[PDB]
Symmetry: C3
Subunit: 175 residues, 3 copies
């Protein structure tokens, strides 16, 4: 029943977190502790709640490696995009072909955000129609360096929390 | 008294997971064979969609299908019906319900050769009065699509034992 | 013992999810008027709350609060209707103070659409509109929004079947999503 209460808790969390315009804003609290868990190998990565391109479109989410992954292991925050298995995948166009933009938000008001954008590569297996729970992640292992992110004269972290944003271009999507 | 609690939860979760607010419903029906079997055996004559809405505070609605057909299409067609349900804000809404409605079975082949029937809601119909109980009498097409066309081995209305039904309400001249 | 608190926590979470809106627009159905006003008068339950609503999925969290038996300036004689900025998950990214026009309404159920509407610009100096510090800023609105007299009469149709509808609408002008 602890498994039942956790199942509930998670379901609640997804419902509370779902967005339906291909736009995700992901609040990451307790930075220091979570990075600590990354460094200690306790909890390598964190996930966003699932979001969607439209109520009945692609199910998606983001994943971050606070202490970096592969190419940015130990030195950067690694930010990855993820196509999940969606309830209506059969009606959707495959491969996934939308432009995607990844962001770390400047909380200073100067709106000096860190943004990387790209066109989804049709040959990538990240964008095939998913087979299990979710396709292989794809994005920037070296999205932003710990140095820039954590630097005191910066405001990417405020009160031990940062905000990540994913935005999917909906151009030429049916719905 | 807690299996009823867990089921009450499960259903509430299901409705929340299923709700749409633009008068548009896409209804995935999985396990076709088994469900049609249940229809034929008289075990489970009909199936319902989760409630959807014209707007967050508009009409509450849903769809209902008789996989083994109903009345005029009994035993030979899939019967697809539209349903006005009792809404939380019915007092603020215009009655009778007067919107054009479109019913669809989706072509999964990519040729987008869907089956679509549309109609204007008849004001004199009691399907469209402000609801009295849980939901007004259903209204639609008892003979929406024949088993023959639907199940046709060379067709793609059923793929991997699942089909998709779509209801679309015209929102013209409605407020939120 | 603790699990009644669990079941209530659930119940409320469910209620918020069922109630949330994301266009700065709230329609608040108030059922069981007579009984709730009774509770107000008896000091049992002075005020009632709406479920939280939002300017956008990631915007300001807000809600409404009513004193059925009135509050302060309208205590005992009016329904008092107040607007409330709550602590939002993304408050750090939002502009402060809150600066949007707000409109408060009691809806005419007769069809004549003769609603009672009060509107105002949010005063930047007001502490109702600072970035919230706890669960929610001090409420602000109309202690004398509508008199029991007007609200309760028969020829009027602000109450029908012992239930009334309140509406809050926030102007989204100059608010990027």
């Amino acid at each position: 029943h602890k498994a039942q209460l956790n199942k509930n808790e998670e379901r609640f969390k997804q419902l509370e977190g779902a967005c339906y315009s291909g736009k995700l804003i992901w609040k990451v609290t307790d930075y220091r502790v979570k990075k600590r868990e990354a460094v200690e190998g306790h909890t390598v990565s964190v996930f966003s709640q699932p979001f969607y391109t439209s109520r009945c479109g692609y199910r998606l989410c983001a994943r971050a490696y606070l202490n970096g992954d592969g190419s940015g292991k130990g030195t950067h925050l690694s930010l990855y995009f993820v196509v999940m298995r969606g309830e209506f995948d059969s009606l959707l166009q495959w491969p996934f072909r939308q432009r995607v933009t990844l962001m770390l938000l400047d909380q200073s008001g100067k709106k000096n955000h860190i943004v990387e954008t790209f066109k989804a590569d049709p040959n990538s297996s990240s964008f095939k129609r998913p087979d299990g729970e979710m396709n292989i992640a794809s994005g920037c292992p070296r999205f932003v360096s710990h140095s820039t992110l954590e630097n005191s004269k910066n405001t990417y972290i405020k009160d031990d929390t940062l905000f990540l944003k994913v935005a999917v271009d909906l151009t030429d999507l049916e719905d």
